[PDB]
């Protein structure tokens, strides 16, 4: 397993569905659109999960970096 | 930047992020807003959990204090500087 830095990892994650959990429990799962040098994520057809359970569907969503807790594919 | 220079040596009350009030003689500052207070006193508002009583104030004398700008919220003039004349 060759080393894969986080920037190339996220770049490969671009275009595929990804769920991101925030520092306060809420989560957002959607098709990753693009990112910036600060990891400001922008998703499409996003669905918001509250406390792990599905809460609703939002759509296109722009979220800053300093608020998200982590990210995971699928 | 006379906005801060004109206020040097005045008795200012600094408002902290936690809700405390540090009242002392504003001596000097810097770009980061780190202030130096002389003969400072710390006040804090405690909520009354027993009954409808007047807000409880717990004063605390500190003397010379150095407040970090990141922890400084605002500052206002409580009163003129200590007059040295009789």
């Amino acid at each position: 397993s060759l080393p894969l830095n986080p920037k190339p990892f996220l770049n490969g994650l671009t275009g595929k569905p990804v769920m991101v959990k925030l520092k306060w429990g809420m989560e957002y799962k959607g098709y990753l659109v693009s990112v910036d040098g600060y990891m400001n994520m922008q998703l499409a057809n996003t669905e918001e999960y509250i406390d792990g359970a599905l809460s609703g569907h939002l759509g296109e969503v722009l979220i800053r970096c300093n608020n998200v807790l982590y990210i995971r594919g699928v | 930047s006379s906005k801060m220079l004109q206020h040097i040596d005045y008795r200012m009350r600094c408002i902290l992020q936690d809700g405390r009030i540090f009242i002392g003689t504003f001596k000097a500052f810097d770009k980061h807003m780190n202030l130096i207070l002389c003969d400072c006193d710390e006040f804090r508002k405690i909520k009354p959990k027993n009954s409808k009583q007047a807000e409880r104030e717990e004063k605390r004398v500190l003397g010379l204090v150095l407040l970090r700008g990141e922890n400084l919220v605002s500052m206002t003039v409580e009163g003129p500087p200590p007059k040295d004349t009789g």
Binding site: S34, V35, D36, M41, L58, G59, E60, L62, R64 | -
Partner: protein, 95 residues
């Protein structure tokens, strides 16, 4: 930055094709947007300008929040200035 020259337009291409293009296209089409801030309140309004710091200039905004039974409270602000650090989420009109 990767382009230490003073003539660098990295912020330009960033706002034009990067994730921050949501605000550029928002001001272009004059579309509304709902923002979730660190105040636990949501601000729904239009945008007129912004920069790298994610500080937008809003107008015709409507603040909304809930306290506690949970009771909702809402008000209106015709012109305001929102900070970026306090922002949590942004959502354009999904229509």
């Amino acid at each position: 930055e990767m382009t230490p020259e003073e003539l660098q337009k990295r912020e330009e291409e960033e706002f034009n094709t990067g994730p921050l293009s949501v605000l550029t296209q928002s001001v272009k089409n004059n579309t509304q947007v709902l923002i979730n801030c660190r105040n636990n309140k949501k601000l729904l309004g239009r945008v007129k300008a912004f920069d790298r710091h994610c500080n937008m200039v809003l107008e015709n905004v409507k603040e909304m929040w809930t306290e506690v039974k949970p009771v909702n409270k809402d008000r209106y602000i015709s012109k305001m200035f929102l900070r970026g650090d306090s922002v949590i989420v942004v959502l354009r009109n999904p229509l």
